[PDB]
């Protein structure tokens, strides 16, 4: 896997996110995680972690795994990096998402995922409170 550029146009929600990509607009979903949507608990709370981490970084990166690229609504696939930070990962740490959408290969980082959960529900965090 390598990384590409992109920058941000908008944070949307805390597993979506509007990005230009090659001079395109385009709505990417993190691959490998489940965030509650707004409406529900720990929606505003993830949203808003995803907004600050991809706002403030100076280097937004996406990652495509081996497979689609687009889901069936358009929208990129993706691992998202904030100066050099996963933003996937960094939101499962935290207990604001879970591993979910686990499709064969579109599972690379799958396990670093999973560790990290493991981690967020050892410490009771959100979620997992
Ligand atoms: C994360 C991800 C979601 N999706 C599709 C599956 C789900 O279809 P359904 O809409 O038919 O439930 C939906 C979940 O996305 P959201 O969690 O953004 O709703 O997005 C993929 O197809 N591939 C993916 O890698
Ligand atoms: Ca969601």
Same mark, same amino acid.
């Given at each position: 896997l390598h990384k590409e550029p992109a920058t941000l146009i908008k944070a949307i929600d805390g597993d979506t996110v509007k990005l230009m990509y090659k001079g395109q607009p385009m709505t990417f979903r993190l691959l490998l995680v489940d965030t509650p949507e707004?409406?529900? $608990?720990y929606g505003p709370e993830a949203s808003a972690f995803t907004k600050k981490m991809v706002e403030n970084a100076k280097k937004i990166e996406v990652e495509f795994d081996?497979?689609?690229?687009?889901?069936?609504?358009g929208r990129g696939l993706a691992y998202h990096y904030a100066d050099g930070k996963m933003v996937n990962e960094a939101l499962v740490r935290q207990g604001? #998402? $879970?591993? #979910?959408?686990?499709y064969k290969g579109n599972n690379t980082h799958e396990q670093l995922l999973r560790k990290a959960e493991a981690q967020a529900k050892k410490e009771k965090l959100n979620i997992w409170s």
């Open positions: 707004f409406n529900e $608990k081996k497979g689609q690229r687009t889901d069936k609504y604001l #998402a $879970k591993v #979910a959408y686990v």
